Design an enzyme around this catalytic site. Structure first.
Site, PDB file in Angstrom:
ATOM      1  N   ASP A   1      15.101  -3.130  12.362  1.00 49.49           N
ATOM      2  CA  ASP A   1      15.638  -1.957  11.658  1.00 49.49           C
ATOM      3  C   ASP A   1      14.706  -0.749  11.831  1.00 49.49           C
ATOM      4  O   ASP A   1      14.400  -0.008  10.882  1.00 49.49           O
ATOM      5  CB  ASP A   1      15.876  -2.305  10.172  1.00 49.49           C
TER       6      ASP A   1
ATOM      7  N   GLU B   1       0.833  -1.195   0.000  1.00 50.05           N
ATOM      8  CA  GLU B   1       0.000   0.000   0.000  1.00 50.05           C
ATOM      9  C   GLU B   1       0.867   1.245   0.000  1.00 50.05           C
ATOM     10  O   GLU B   1       1.932   1.280   0.583  1.00 50.05           O
ATOM     11  CB  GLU B   1      -0.995   0.016   1.168  1.00 50.05           C
TER      12      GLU B   1
HETATM   13  O1  LIG Z   1      10.593  -1.334   2.095  1.00 45.69           O
HETATM   14  C1  LIG Z   1      10.620  -0.130   1.859  1.00 45.69           C
HETATM   15  N1  LIG Z   1      11.751   0.687   1.890  1.00 45.69           N
HETATM   16  C2  LIG Z   1      11.658   2.062   1.596  1.00 45.69           C
HETATM   17  C3  LIG Z   1      12.798   2.849   1.715  1.00 45.69           C
HETATM   18  C4  LIG Z   1      13.507   2.844   2.927  1.00 45.69           C
HETATM   19  C5  LIG Z   1      14.661   3.614   3.139  1.00 45.69           C
HETATM   20  C6  LIG Z   1      15.108   4.450   2.127  1.00 45.69           C
HETATM   21  N2  LIG Z   1      16.216   5.213   2.127  1.00 45.69           N
HETATM   22  C7  LIG Z   1      16.640   6.310   2.998  1.00 45.69           C
HETATM   23  C8  LIG Z   1      15.892   7.631   2.780  1.00 45.69           C
HETATM   24  C9  LIG Z   1      14.938   7.662   1.589  1.00 45.69           C
HETATM   25  C10 LIG Z   1      14.069   8.918   1.738  1.00 45.69           C
HETATM   26  N3  LIG Z   1      14.543   9.824   2.823  1.00 45.69           N
HETATM   27  C11 LIG Z   1      16.008  10.115   2.745  1.00 45.69           C
HETATM   28  C12 LIG Z   1      16.845   8.817   2.664  1.00 45.69           C
HETATM   29  C13 LIG Z   1      14.401   4.430   0.939  1.00 45.69           C
HETATM   30  C14 LIG Z   1      13.266   3.674   0.744  1.00 45.69           C
HETATM   31 CL1  LIG Z   1      12.522   3.755  -0.781  1.00 45.69          CL
HETATM   32  N4  LIG Z   1      10.479   2.599   1.275  1.00 45.69           N
HETATM   33  C15 LIG Z   1       9.407   1.807   1.241  1.00 45.69           C
HETATM   34  C16 LIG Z   1       9.453   0.459   1.532  1.00 45.69           C
HETATM   35  O2  LIG Z   1       8.229  -0.085   1.423  1.00 45.69           O
HETATM   36  C17 LIG Z   1       7.375   0.881   1.080  1.00 45.69           C
HETATM   37  C18 LIG Z   1       6.017   0.841   0.852  1.00 45.69           C
HETATM   38  C19 LIG Z   1       5.335   1.983   0.508  1.00 45.69           C
HETATM   39  C20 LIG Z   1       6.084   3.151   0.408  1.00 45.69           C
HETATM   40 BR1  LIG Z   1       5.283   4.847  -0.079  1.00 45.69          BR
HETATM   41  C21 LIG Z   1       7.461   3.167   0.648  1.00 45.69           C
HETATM   42  C22 LIG Z   1       8.097   2.039   0.978  1.00 45.69           C
END
Ligand SMILES: O=c1[nH]c(-c2ccc(NCC3CCNCC3)cc2Cl)nc2c1oc1ccc(Br)cc12
Length: 274
Positions: free
Chosen positions: A135, A89
């Site tokens: 995490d 989602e």
């Molecule tokens: O598993 C995920 N990792 C991540 C994810 C976790 C850490 C990061 N990286 C570090 C951050 C990224 C944004 N803020 C600055 C640096 C990036 C993502 Cl893309 N996002 C999602 C993840 O599942 C999601 C489901 C829906 C939505 Br909207 C987003 C996610």
């Protein structure tokens, strides 16, 4: 079958987790997230009720999926030649805590509390479902800005919860407890509480309290911003060096500083300007 069910959009981000993209379900236009994970990079696999090989991530997500909106929902997933794909989602509009904290600095305590409470409630849920996240950190918490609701994401490092010791870790170092750094062994609930202690400090101070193994092992906490003493106390408690000295969730939530939490919706009105 297949994409063409969904409609890929901008890349949202990537890393050791893989790659995540904005997307729409073509049929009913649901906002979703499409997360691609390469098989070679997966390291911790498990198997479903129906008995098949899958990334642990997927097992954990299925175990915790439900009405409860504190944890991201898994909507569907697919297997590929050299990758998996998870459809999650997406709330819209959304911002992760990290970005929110970069943008707005050390949070006001009223807000940290609403937020932190919501995290606490989300984690309890995971532990209720036998899942341990491993995490917890500002990047892995999403804010649904309309509803003032926090969702936990990225179970790529998690594990079935157990009462015996853990000797593996592939979470985020600076959030790991001293007992990992020294001995390469930890227990789930007490490791969680420590990372929550890092999380609260991050919220109330605009940053994480330790950047080096040395500081983790030492465990003295310095506050670089005005923070009330109850808050400071709660954080120092979660960051007790000896694991068994850390509070249980019950104790965290019965702690003075955690009284009179704003509902998520009144949080949004007052603090997300909405
Ligand atoms: O598993 C995920 N990792 C991540 C994810 C976790 C850490 C990061 N990286 C570090 C951050 C990224 C944004 N803020 C600055 C640096 C990036 C993502 Cl893309 N996002 C999602 C993840 O599942 C999601 C489901 C829906 C939505 Br909207 C987003 C996610």
């Amino acid at each position: 079958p297949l994409e063409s069910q969904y409609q890929v959009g901008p890349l949202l981000g990537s890393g050791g987790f893989g790659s995540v993209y904005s997307g729409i379900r073509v049929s009913d236009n649901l906002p979703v997230a499409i997360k691609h994970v390469e098989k070679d990079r997966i390291s911790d696999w498990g198997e479903l009720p129906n008995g098949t090989r899958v990334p642990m991530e997927v097992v954990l997500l299925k175990k915790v999926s439900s009405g409860f909106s504190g944890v991201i929902r898994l909507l569907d997933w697919f297997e590929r030649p050299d990758s998996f794909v998870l459809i999650l989602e997406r709330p819209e509009p959304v911002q992760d805590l990290f970005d929110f904290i970069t943008e707005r600095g050390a949070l006001q305590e009223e807000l940290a509390r609403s937020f932190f409470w919501q995290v606490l409630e989300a984690v309890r849920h995971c532990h209720n479902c036998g899942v341990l996240h491993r995490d917890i950190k500002d990047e892995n918490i999403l804010i649904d800005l309309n509803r003032g609701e926090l969702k936990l994401i990225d179970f790529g490092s998690g594990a079935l919860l157990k009462d015996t010791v853990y000797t593996d870790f592939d979470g985020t170092r600076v959030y790991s407890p001293p007992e990992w750094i020294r001995y390469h062994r930890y227990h789930g609930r007490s490791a969680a509480v420590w990372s929550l202690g890092i999380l609260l400090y991050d919220m109330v101070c605009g940053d994480i309290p330790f950047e080096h193994d040395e500081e983790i092992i030492r465990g003295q906490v310095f506050f670089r911003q005005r923070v009330s003493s109850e808050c400071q106390h709660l954080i120092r408690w979660c960051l007790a060096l000896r694991p068994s000295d850390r509070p249980t969730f019950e104790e965290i939530q019965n702690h003075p500083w955690m009284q009179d939490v704003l509902l998520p919706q009144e949080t949004a009105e007052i603090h997300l300007h909405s």
